[PDB]
Amino acid sequence: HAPPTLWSRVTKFGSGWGFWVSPTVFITTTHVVPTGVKEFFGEPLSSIAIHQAGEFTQFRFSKKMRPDLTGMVLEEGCPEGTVCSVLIKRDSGELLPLAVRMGAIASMRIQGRLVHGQSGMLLLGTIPGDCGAPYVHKRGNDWVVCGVHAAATKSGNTVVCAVQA
Numbered sequence: 001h002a003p004p005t006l007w008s009r010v011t012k013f014g015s016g017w018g019f020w021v022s023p024t025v026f027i028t029t030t031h032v033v034p035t036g037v038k039e040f041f042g043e044p045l046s047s048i049a050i051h052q053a054g055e056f057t058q059f060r061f062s063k064k065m066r067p068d069l070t071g072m073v074l075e076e077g078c079p080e081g082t083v084c085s086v087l088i089k090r091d092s093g094e095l096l097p098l099a100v101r102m103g104a105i106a107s108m109r110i111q112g113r114l115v116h117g118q119s120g121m122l123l124l125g126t127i128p129g130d131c132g133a134p135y136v137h138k139r140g141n142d143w144v145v146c147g148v149h150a151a152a153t154k155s156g157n158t159v160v161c162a163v164q165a
């Protein structure tokens with residue numbers, strides 16, 4: 001049961017979504033970031049610390065963009081066998097949380113790109129435009145985010161999230 005505040009962190013961005021880890025840190029999948037844009041959320045690129053690798057992108061802003069949020073833990077993937085929720089938002093507004101059992105972390109070549117990824121098997125499917133949606137799981141009392149949606153095989157039952165370096 002992801003609460004409304006956790007859903008409110010999922011944010012429309014470029015050709016997909018991103019996720020507010022904290023009031024200043026925003027993560028997404030690199031390939032959804034719009035490329036001829038010089039401002040993100042009213043901020044100029046010069047005010048954003050940007051870290052990117054293996055299709056995982058992090059922005060750190062110079063000002064509290066989402067002061068309503070608490071900071072939560074961002075992990076480099078999760079343990080194999082962890083069940084995670086993919087907090088998918090559709091453009092219609094529909095909320096679609098997908099349960100996924102996470103497999104191994106690995107380097108992957110997907111449509112010509114290197115992805116530092118973690119595979120997962122769904123337990124509905126994903127579509128173009130869902131990329132950047134967060135992979136989250138509960139750590140007892142709290143929620144942990146550990147990936148952003150990147151790919152789903154030809155089949156449909158396996159998904160890939162990019163994870164931090």
Ligand SMILES: *[C@@H](O)[C@H](C[C@@H]1CCNC1=O)NC(=O)[C@H](CC1CCCCC1)NS(=O)(=O)CCCOc1ccc(OC)cc1
Binds near residue numbers: 031109110127
């Ligand atoms: C989001 O942009 C979209 C989500 C995806 C669309 C179809 N269903 C989904 O969940 N992701 C893609 O379209 C993805 C884009 C690439 C772009 C470069 C960076 C990586 C992602 N392409 S794809 O259609 O998902 C590729 C399908 C093949 O999937 C795999 C998965 C694992 C793997 O490792 C061996 C190889 C290929």
